[PDB]
Amino acid sequence: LPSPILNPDIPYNQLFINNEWQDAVSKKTFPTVNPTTGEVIGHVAEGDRADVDRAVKAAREAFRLGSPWRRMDASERGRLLNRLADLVERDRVYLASLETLDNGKPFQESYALDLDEVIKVYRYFAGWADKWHGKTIPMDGQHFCFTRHEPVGVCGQIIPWNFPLVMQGWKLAPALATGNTVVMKVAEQTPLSALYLASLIKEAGFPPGVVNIITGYGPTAGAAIAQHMDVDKVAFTGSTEVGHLIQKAAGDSNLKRVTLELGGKSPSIVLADADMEHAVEQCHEALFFNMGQCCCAGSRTFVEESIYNEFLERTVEKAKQRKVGNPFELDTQQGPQVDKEQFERVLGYIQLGQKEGAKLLCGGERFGERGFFIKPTVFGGVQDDMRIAKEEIFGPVQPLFKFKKIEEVVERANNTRYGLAAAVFTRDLDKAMYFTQALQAGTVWVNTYNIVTCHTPFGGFKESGNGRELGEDGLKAYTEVKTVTIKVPQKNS
Amino acid sequence: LPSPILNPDIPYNQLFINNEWQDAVSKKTFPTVNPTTGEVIGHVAEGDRADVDRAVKAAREAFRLGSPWRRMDASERGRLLNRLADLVERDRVYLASLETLDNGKPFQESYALDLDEVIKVYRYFAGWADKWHGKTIPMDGQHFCFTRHEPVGVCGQIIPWNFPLVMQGWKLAPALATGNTVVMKVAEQTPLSALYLASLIKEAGFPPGVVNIITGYGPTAGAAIAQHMDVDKVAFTGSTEVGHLIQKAAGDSNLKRVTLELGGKSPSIVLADADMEHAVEQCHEALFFNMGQCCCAGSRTFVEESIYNEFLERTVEKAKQRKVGNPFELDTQQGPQVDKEQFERVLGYIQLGQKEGAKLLCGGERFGERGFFIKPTVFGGVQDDMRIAKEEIFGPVQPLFKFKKIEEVVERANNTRYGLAAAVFTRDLDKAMYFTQALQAGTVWVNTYNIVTCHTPFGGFKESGNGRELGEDGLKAYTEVKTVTIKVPQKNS
C-alpha cells in the first residue's frame, strides 16, 4: 500500500562482530546483484574461517557465566526483542524496499507479508522469554527434583536467500529469547537486509557479541561454523544436500546439537467435492508465491479425475493472468528469479519436462530481455516417474497430476524423500480427518496453503528436516535441560 | 533378599525378529563369557547387516498405517507395557541371576537395584502412553491449528553392556509408549538377559515386528542400523568415540533423528562444611558402584583443602573394606570387570596413573587369579593434566583431587569435553544453589549421587550426549510433531 524507496542508501556492507562493522581479515569483497536489472548493486565483505573464529570468540564471551547477557532478567531479553520489533516497524518501508532490491520479490509481498512476519516473530518470541518453565518432579525417595531450562550456548545459524529477513527472524528470535548467543551466516545472494537489521540490533541495545552477522560463501564461512569446536549448536535452513553435510560436520567436530530445515516437494490434493474456484486459487498461489522459491511450495498439484479438465483449464487461465514484471510496481505478482544460476536451473527443468513427455500448457520460457524473469509455466499429464515430479524445481512451474482413489493419492503424495508440507481441499469432515493422519508431512493444511506464522511449529518429516522451528515447540532446540536432584531431610507430598 | 539361581537354563540364544527366534542368515554364532570364571556360558547368533535388514523390514510392516500397532488405543500400548512389567516381576530372580552370570554385577545389585529399575521404567512409561498430549494453538487468521504427537517411526536402538536390562528398558519403554517400533542391538558382552526379556515381550502380547532384538558386533550389526535408509531414528548409548560415528552415519544416510547418551568424567565436589562420614560414603559408592562401570560414575573426587587428609584416609579405608568376590554371594559388593579387554584396559590405566606420578594408596592390581577381578584402587595427589584425570577409566579406580576456592573447583570440574553429571556435598544453602547453576552437567546432585530414576531426565552437556532420556522429557525424542492447520468459517476466542 505505501510507496517504495526505489533506490535507497545502503550504508551497511561489512561483517557485524561484537557490535562493530568490519572488513574480512583478507579484505576481500563479493558482488550482490539486483535480479530485475541483472546489474551489480554493490560489494559486501567476504567472510571466511578466520572471520568466523572472531565471531565465535565474541559470542563465547557474551555468553560467559556472569556476563550482562547471562545475568540480565529473562524479561529484559524480552523487552529488547520487542524494541527490535518497534525499530523494524519504524524502518519497514526501507527494509521491504531493500529486500525487493536484493532478492527480487514483489514489494507488495516484501511490505505486506515478509515484513509483517518479521515484526510478529520478534514480538512473539519476546513474550516467550520469561514464560519458558522447567519442572518440579515428584520422584521416588527423599529428594527434591527440578529441571532448569538453560540456553544451549553459542548458536551457529545458517540461512538461505528466498526469505532473507523472515528466515533471519525465525532463527534469531527464539535463540535470543532463550538467552543464547549467535553467529549467523546469511546467504551470498541476499546479504543486504540482514546487515541493516544488525544495525537495529545494536540500536535496540543488545550487548556486544550477542548477535554476530557474517556474509560469505557456504563452503567457506558456513562450513567453518558447522565444523567449529566452540559452537554448541547449529541451526541450518537450506537444501537437503547441504543438510547431510551439516549433520556429518557435527558428528565430525564436537557433537554440536543440530536442527535442519530442508527441501520439499509438497503436494496439494484436490478432491471432487472441493470448492473448485477456491482450490484452483489456493493451489495456484501455493506454487507461484514468491516465484515458486518457497520451500513448502505446493509443487505437485493432485486433482481427482472427475474434476481434472475443469481444474486444468482454470489453472492455466490463472497462470496466464499472473502479472510478471518490475517488483517495485505495486500490482506486480511475480518478480524475477534470484540469480543467473537459479534462472538457468528453472529453464533447465522446463526443457526436461518437455523431453520427458509432459504437456507444456503455457509459459515455458524467459519473460522479456532484462533480468531473470520466467513466464508462469503449467505442465499437464505429469507422471510420478518423471524428474519434474521428483526433484525440487524451486521456480514458477506447476505440474498437474491426476488420481482416482483416496488410497492411491496418499501413497503417491507420500512416495518421496521429502516431507515438509501438504494440503487437502475438501468439504467432507471424514476425508479431511483421514488425510491429516495419513499424509507424512510436518504441516498439513486443510482448505488453505502456506499459513506458517510465529505460533505454528514448522519442519520436515524424512529428509525435509530434523526438529521444528516456531511456536513453543521451536524453543526446545535452543534449550539445554539440567536436572537438579537434592537430598532432603524428609519428604512430604 | 532371595537366593539366586546359580545354574539357570538359558533357552533363548537366537535373533528375535517378527516374534520368531531365528539364526543369523550366515549361521555364524559367537561366544559370551562368564566374567567370574572366565569360561564360555554359550553361543548366540552373530547378526550382521542382512539380519538388521530383516528386522527393519519387520519393524516397518508393524509400523504401517492400519497395522494392529498403529490403530491400537494408546492406553492399550500402556496395558501391554504394564503386563511386561508384571512378567519381569514374576521372573525377577531368574532375570537378575542371568544378569549376574553374564555381566558379573553382584546379585545384590542385580536383584534389588537393576531389576527394581527395569520394573519401574516399564510401569512409568506405561502410564505416559495415553497422557502425551499435543496442543491447540490460538493462531492468527480464520484457522483452527493443532499439533499431533506422532511416533517417529522405526527406531534403531543400540545399548552398552554395563546395565543390560536397565539400558534396554530405558530405550524400549518410552519408544513403545509413544507408538514406535524398534530394532535393538544389544552389546556383544551381555546378550542373554535381553533375549529372555524378548520372550516376555512376546508373552505379554506385543504384535510381531514391534520389538526386534539383534545380537552381534558394533561395526557390523550396530553400524548397519545407524546407516540404514529405512530407519527413522537412532538412539545410541555408548562411548563418545562411537557417538561421533553415529551422528556422522545419520548425516551420511537418511537424516535419521539422533539421540546420543555418551561417556563421562563426572566430578563429586566435597566442601568443608559437608557431613564427612556421609560425603565419604557417597563419593565412595559414586565411583565404585557397578565395579566403576557406570557412565555417570563420580570419577573425579574434589575435596576442599582443610578436610582433604581426613577424607583421603577414610576413602582409603572404605576402598580396603569393599567386599570383592563371587557376585552370587549375597554380600559381595564388587564383582569382576565385564571381559578380558575391559579388565586389561583398567590395569593399563592403573599402571599409567603411577607412571604419571599419581600416588597409589591401595589396591592397584588383580584380585586373585581367575576371572576379571581388580582390587579397589584409590589415587591421591592427582593433577588435572594427567591422563587418569581426563580419560574415562570405567573401572574401580578413584582419583582424589585437592582444591581451595569455589571459583577454582567450578573451573576445574567444568574443564572437560564431558558433561553428563556432577555432585556437590554441602550444608550451605547459597553454595548448593550456586553449584547447581555453575556446573556444566546434565544432572547435578546435591548431597547424594547416582539417583537416576524413571522420573528424572538424564543426558549430557557437550560431548556426553545430545538429547535426554527418561521422564516426560524423554518422550520428545520418540515423537515427530505434525502441525495441522484448518481453514474455518469464522474464528471466535
Ligand SMILES: NC(=O)c1ccc[n+]([C@@H]2O[C@H](COP(=O)([O-])OP(=O)(O)OC[C@H]3O[C@@H](n4cnc5c(N)ncnc54)[C@H](O)[C@@H]3O)[C@@H](O)[C@H]2O)c1
Ligand atoms: N524448510 C525451511 O524452512 C526452508 C526455508 C527456506 C528454504 N529452504 C530450502 O533452501 C533451499 C534453497 O536455498 P539455498 O539454495 O540457498 O540452499 P543451500 O543449501 O545451497 O544454501 C543455504 C545456506 O547454506 C550455505 N551453504 C552452502 N553450502 C554450504 C556448506 N557446504 N556448508 C555450510 N553452509 C553452506 C549457503 O551459503 C546459504 O547460506 C531449498 O532447497 C529450499 O527448500 C527450506
Ligand SMILES: NC(=O)c1ccc[n+]([C@@H]2O[C@H](COP(=O)([O-])OP(=O)(O)OC[C@H]3O[C@@H](n4cnc5c(N)ncnc54)[C@H](O)[C@@H]3O)[C@@H](O)[C@H]2O)c1
Ligand atoms: N549416558 C548414558 O546413559 C550411558 C549409560 C551407560 C553407558 N554409557 C557409556 O557406554 C560406554 C561403555 O559401553 P561400551 O563399551 O559397550 O561402548 P561402545 O561405544 O564401544 O559400544 C556400545 C554399543 O554400540 C555398539 N557399537 C560399537 N561400535 C559401533 C559402531 N562403530 N557402530 C555402531 N554400533 C557400535 C556395541 O556393540 C554396543 O552395542 C561408556 O563410555 C559409558 O559411559 C553411557
Ligand SMILES: COc1ccccc1-n1cc(-c2ccc(-c3ccccc3)cc2)[n+]2c1CCCCC2
Ligand atoms: C512471508 O510469508 C511466508 C514465508 C514462508 C512460507 C509461507 C509464507 N506465507 C505465504 C502466505 C500466503 C498465503 C496466501 C496467499 C494467497 C494470496 C491470494 C490468494 C490466495 C492465497 C499468499 C501468500 N502467507 C505467508 C505467511 C503466513 C501467513 C500470511 C500469508
Ligand SMILES: COc1ccccc1-n1cc(-c2ccc(-c3ccccc3)cc2)[n+]2c1CCCCC2
Ligand atoms: C540401576 O541403577 C543405576 C543405573 C544407572 C545409573 C545409576 C543407577 N543407580 C545407582 C544407585 C545407587 C545409589 C546409591 C547407592 C549407595 C549405596 C550405599 C551407600 C551409599 C549409596 C548405590 C547405588 N541407584 C541407582 C538407580 C536408582 C536410584 C537409587 C539407587
Ligand code: NA
Ligand atoms: Na542479490
Ligand code: NA
Ligand atoms: Na558375558
